[PDB]
Amino acid sequence: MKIVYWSGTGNTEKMAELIAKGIIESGKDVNTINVSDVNIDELLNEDILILGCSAMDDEVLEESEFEPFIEEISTKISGKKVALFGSYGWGDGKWMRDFEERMNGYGCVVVETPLIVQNEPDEAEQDCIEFGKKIANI
């Protein structure tokens, strides 16, 4: 499987690493890829797309790299399974509710409840690992 993410200070990156750890612990292989290094064509062959991005202002996806990526793949992912995650700061998850609505709008099947964590995982570490285990059970 593959995990694609954008992280500005490392919070979401840390989540990505933990989610990957859960998938691997379940006996499966997974590669984490920063959005700047992703190859679209290779990503489109995946069964499940695991995507992550922190909340930028105001309650939107990161604009310079992550959103353009989402826009680019939007017309090629109908029927695909996706799992969403991200770290946020002061909000209540509005950016994620919108991210989930958007992916469903493109015809994607959002397989699990999106995982959101405030700031760095730390206390939510096991939660991240378990989220990965849930995805490996799909």
Ligand X SMILES: Cc1cc2nc3c(=O)[nH]c(=O)nc-3n(C[C@H](O)[C@H](O)[C@H](O)COP(=O)(O)O)c2cc1C
Q: Cβ closer to ligand X: 74 or 119?
A: 119
What is the smallest separation between the CB atom of 101 and ligand X, expressed in angstroms?
Answer: 17
For the segment 19-48, give every residue that binds ligand X (CB under 6 A).
Answer: none
Point out which span in 1-9, 24-32, 42-50, 73-81 binds ligand X (CB under 6 A): 1-9
For the segment 63-92, give every residue that binds ligand X (CB under 6 A).
Answer: 87-91
* Residue 7 binds ligand X, judged by CB under 6 A: yes
Q: Cβ closer to ligand X: 11 or 80?
A: 11
SS3 labels along the chain: CEEEEECCCCHHHHHHHHHHHHHHHCCCCCEEEEHHHCCHHHHCCCCEEEEEECCECCCECCCCCHHHHHHHHHHHCCCCEEEEEEEECCCCCHHHHHHHHHHHHCCCEECCCCEEEECCCHHHHHHHHHHHHHHHCC
* Residue 55 binds ligand X, judged by CB under 6 A: yes
Residue numbers at the binding site for ligand X (CB under 6 A):
7-12, 54-59, 87-91, 119
